[PDB]
Amino acid sequence: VQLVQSGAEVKKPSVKVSCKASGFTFGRDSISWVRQAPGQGLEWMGVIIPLVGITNYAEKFQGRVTITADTSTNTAYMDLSSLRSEDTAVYYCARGDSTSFYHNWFDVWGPGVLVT
Amino acid sequence: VQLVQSGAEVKKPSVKVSCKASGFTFGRDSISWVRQAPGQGLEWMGVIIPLVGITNYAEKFQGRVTITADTSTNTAYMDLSSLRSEDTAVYYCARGDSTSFYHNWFDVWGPGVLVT
Amino acid sequence: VQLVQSGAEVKKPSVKVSCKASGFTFGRDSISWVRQAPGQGLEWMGVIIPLVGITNYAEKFQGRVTITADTSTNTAYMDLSSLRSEDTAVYYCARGDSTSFYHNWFDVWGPGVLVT
Amino acid sequence: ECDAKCQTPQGAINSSLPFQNVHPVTIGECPKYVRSAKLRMVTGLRNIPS
Amino acid sequence: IVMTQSPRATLSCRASQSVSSYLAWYQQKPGQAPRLLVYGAFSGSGSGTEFTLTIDVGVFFCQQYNIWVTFGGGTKV
Amino acid sequence: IVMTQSPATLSCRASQSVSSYLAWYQQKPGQAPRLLVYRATGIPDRFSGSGSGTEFTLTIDVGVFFCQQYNIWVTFGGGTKV
Amino acid sequence: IVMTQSPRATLSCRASQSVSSYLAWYQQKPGQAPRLLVYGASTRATGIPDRFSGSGSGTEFTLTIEDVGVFFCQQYNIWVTFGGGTKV
Amino acid sequence: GAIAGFIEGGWTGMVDGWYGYHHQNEQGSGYAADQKSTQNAINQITNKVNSVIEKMNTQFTAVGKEFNKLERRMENLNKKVDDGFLDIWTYNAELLVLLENERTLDFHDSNVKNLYEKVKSQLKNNAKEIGNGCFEFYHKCNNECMESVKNGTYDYPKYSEESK
Amino acid sequence: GAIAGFIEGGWTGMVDGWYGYHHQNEQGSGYAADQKSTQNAINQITNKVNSVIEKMNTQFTAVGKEFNKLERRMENLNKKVDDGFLDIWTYNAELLVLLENERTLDFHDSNVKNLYEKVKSQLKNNAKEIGNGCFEFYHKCNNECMESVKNGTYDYPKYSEESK
Amino acid sequence: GAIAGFIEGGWTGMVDGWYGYHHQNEQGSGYAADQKSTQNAINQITNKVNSVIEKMNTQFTAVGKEFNKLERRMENLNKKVDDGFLDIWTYNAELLVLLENERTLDFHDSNVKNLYEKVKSQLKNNAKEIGNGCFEFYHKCNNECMESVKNGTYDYPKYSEESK
Amino acid sequence: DTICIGYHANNSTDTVDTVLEKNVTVTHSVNLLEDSHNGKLCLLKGIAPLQLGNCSVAGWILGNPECELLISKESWSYIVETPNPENGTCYPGYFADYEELREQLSSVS
């Protein structure tokens, strides 16, 4: 299954990326989001179990990133606020496991969305 | 809403007054009865909650007055027994509240029924 | 109501007797089986509550008899194993009570099945 | 030129919830009709912020 | 528990026991069922002790609902 | 536990406390028994039992009579010689 | 948790804190999203030609071995954090 | 100021996990979260919602057919059957959600009490239970003490002497 | 005397309120009632009954309709649909009530035990619980102690000295 | 050897009844069973399953109907009503058992804890609760104590002297 | 010193209804009902639907001159008809068994 996305999100220095479920109906999922810096290793950004609404964000990125779910359309957004000039990076959309909410490994990945 | 009544029940020295509910639901409100002596202040008789059937009688009138509900036709009677010559007075049909079963104030009142 | 049985089941030196409930639908009943020795007093075999599945066997006969129940066709069998030459006796099908699973008296009896 | 799982005279429907109340007339694969105003399930705790 | 009545009009009902803010004033015309004016304190005032009702002709009743229910005397106005 | 029969009145001896937990079984030769008294239905009340605790009597139809106890598990007696 | 990378191919990822058997090795070609190779350092995953495998626990694990690009080692015993990129 | 809240009300500073301790100590203040009960609750809730949702399937049909002025009986029959189904479904759905919304809350409010009873049973007598919702140790022990009491390795005999 | 209540059948001298007390003391014998739990029980029971009753609706109809001998095919279908509805409704209602009459009884029999546990927790150690359904105090005091234990302001340190 | 099991897992040598004991004593080893709780559980389970099964009655009917090329509206209506009933019945039958298999397990797992608390209350202080699921007596006595603890006739004051 | 037990709580203001209490607030929830329509017709699989504007099924089959068919049609998933059709049968008449013809033409390939 391939997780489609919105598309290019180039904007002047709020941002709302989007993800969608395709091929598999929404069920036991732990959609997680990973930010790939242009020349650094991958970081971690958050995790959500949309079927219940339980959110959980990383240690550093508590005050900015607010991942929310939407059961109706099988989606999951960001509401990243107070954008900076050092956050220009690709934002994936990685699945996971729901029975291991505290030990999660990413299996499926999305194509990619530019943000700057 | 106006609480209809049976009518005059004058009888020689058991009396079964009746009270009817019209225009409102019979499940969310209590019912209390007040006796108006000809030359004395009002007194308290009892209280009913229809769906659960709880009854709670005054300190003096426990021995004689036995009031009960009937949810079939939204009614409430007195099975008053051992009538005397000092009980000649009017008997109203006052509504109260259910969420305040121990602190009740009478909002609606009935027309009146003679008893002697 | 008389409990029908399989019939003659003489076997050379495994065995599967059967007993069916007829006339009365299977309900709050407790089937029990008694072995009538040719010249000795009766002995106890087991007891079932087929609607629940509980079984309870005699003290000596724990290792051999295996009474099972099938609520689909209202039956009860013995999966008796390791047959000997001293077990030749008639096996009945007696009905007890469910509310008194530890104090049971046999009310109805079956016609009888011979086993050699 | 959009695409949807089913349709209604008032328009198309994009959700996949197991209930709906917009209209009973439908063609396609969509949930049943229910007259209840609003219903929702609870998967949390009691919210007393102390 | 007992109460007594006071013999531009201002009316008051004395209380022989603590009542807090649990009271209501009943106004009725002769030969008719009463009606409720205000509860918890024309306008009322005061709490914990004897209340004041500052002000439609007839008899006024002051009723408390702290322990069971009881009614006071009849106003003579 | 063991019950012994008495070799009209009949009785069965008990080697342990049984209280009021007994029943007398009547069978004709060649047929399955039937329940008499523990009274049961379909009985001409010609016969009845008495006593409890340690010794029981059955005061009084030809064959063999069985006395059965159900205080702990179930066990039968040797039988009646009549 | 900070991790260090390894500059018949053997790659290792030193762990500054005890991890036991909680890793997974990620391999990606340039320009595409990564794909998972193996998890648990001992349990092989799907889509694998058995050309590569790993071993060890509670210590840096050796990843013994188209397969050209950058490899990532990830730990999931306290939240999730990624290590440095392989230079191959 | 760290008033226990499983009777009064929940805290705010906890983000990850539903049920969590408060591992207060000297120079060690900071919230935490139990690593096992939350996962069980998550599994239970996901199973309940999945069972409620994914138990139904639909086909290709719906209300609405046309008739002339002579087939009035058939029109009445069609209206009757459609109304019957439209009543049954609403009643079933309403009662289903109304029944589930109480069971889930009772389960969530029993889990915390079970956890508190477990942590109380582990600490036999060294805990001076205030009753407001949590304890107050007699002996002094470091963050390893809190790690042990969370894990479940605390014991009486080793620390028994300092208690008395 | 005042035999324990909630491990056996309840008393008969209590008229006002379901759950109550027995404020026995010197020259102060006489029943009473709790004015904070029975109100919650009343509210919940009324809510449950109202939700069960007022959920359905009905509209105008005329079930009776006839046909001639030519079109028995339609009667064989009208009878079928009527029987289907007539079976579904009973099989719903019977189970609904058979579940409600168990849930409400369980709730009513848990509330009293919760109240007893609360009143036990308040009285830390001055009690001398017989174990049947109530206690027997050590220190002697007037009805103020009963009124406080009803209210919940009873304190242990003030009366601690007289206990030992 | 006689590891308590109502928290870890059931035994395998217990065949007489569901809930049991372990009368471990000098020259007295051997399992047993409780002859009062098992009977109540049996009655409850029989009542539940009988109520589930026997509430439905059956009667002589038919299903198959055929039509000719014309009057296709009747065939569409018959298919619609048949599908409606075929959906409603399965949606009821699934949830019925899906709730019963939870209620029964909850009841069965509550009964054992109730029995444990009942046996704990009688042994006021003579029992040194290991915490793994059972006790360990201080005083020594023969099988009479084991029989009494089932009989409910055990007393504290008689053995308190040897307990201290 | 104090290992105190609590649970999560936030400022989410929602409302659910239980069988005991009404209008209670909870931290999270999931909605089982939706009231939302796109407002315009889309493609229900297949290829496309028909558009019989200012026409009717009884007028397309006989080919009313002022309806001019629908230019050309080859396949469709479902029919769309204006609720108030003007052009039916120009020559007055009575289409025999017309009602079942709608059933026959409801689903064709």
Residue numbers in the entry:
A (entry chain J), B (entry chain H), C (entry chain G): 2 to 14, 17 to 52, 52A, 53 to 82, 82A, 82B, 82C, 83 to 100, ...
D (entry chain E): 276 to 325
E (entry chain L): 2 to 8, 18 to 51, 62 to 75, 82 to 94, 96 to 104
F (entry chain I): 2 to 8, 19 to 49, 54 to 75, 82 to 94, 96 to 104
G (entry chain K): 2 to 8, 18 to 75, 81 to 94, 96 to 104
H (entry chain F), I (entry chain B), J (entry chain D): 4 to 167
K (entry chain E): 11 to 55, 55A, 56 to 79, 79A, 80 to 93, 93A, 94 to 116
Q: Anything the authors wrote about it?
A:
Structurally, HA is composed of a hypervariable head domain and a less variable stem region; the latter contains several functionally conserved epitopes targeted by heterosubtypic broadly neutralizing antibody (bnAb) lineages. The HA stem also contains another antigenic supersite, termed the anchor epitope, which is membrane proximal. Here, we show that macaques vaccinated with a HA stem immunogen elicit human-like public B cell lineages targeting two major conserved sites of vulnerability, the central stem and anchor epitopes. Similarly, macaques produced anchor bnAbs with the human-like NWP motif. Both bnAb lineages were functionally and structurally analogous to their human counterparts, with recognition mediated largely by germline-encoded motifs.
The overwhelming use of VH1–138 in central stem-targeting BCRs, with up to 70% of the upper HA+ cluster, suggests that the immunoglobulin repertoire in macaques may be similarly endowed with intrinsic affinity to the HA stem. While known macaque VH1–138 alleles do not encode for the canonical human I53/F54 motif, the mAbs and bnAbs derived from them do contain a hydrophobic CDR H2 apex with either a germline-encoded L53/V54 or a somatically mutated L53/A54. CDR H2 contributes the majority of the antibody paratope with germline-encoded residues L53HC, V54HC and I56HC mediating contact to the hydrophobic groove on the HA stem. Specifically, L53HC interacts with helix A residues V52HA2 and N53HA2 as well as HA1 residue V40HA1. Residue V54HC interacts with W21HA2 residing at the epicenter of the hydrophobic groove as well as I48HA2 and T49HA2 on helix A. I56HC also interacts with W21HA2 and I45HA2. CDR H3 Y100AHC interacts with I45HA2 as well as G20HA2, T41HA2 and Q38HA2. The only light chain interaction occurs through CDR L3 W94LC to D19HA2. Additionally, we found that the presence of a hydrophobic residue at position 56 aided in the overall binding stability to HA. Akin to humans, macaque central stem mAbs neutralized multiple influenza reporter viruses within group 1 IAVs, including homotypic vaccine matched H1N1 NC99 and heterologous H1N1 MI15, H5N1 VN04, and H2N2 SG57 viruses.
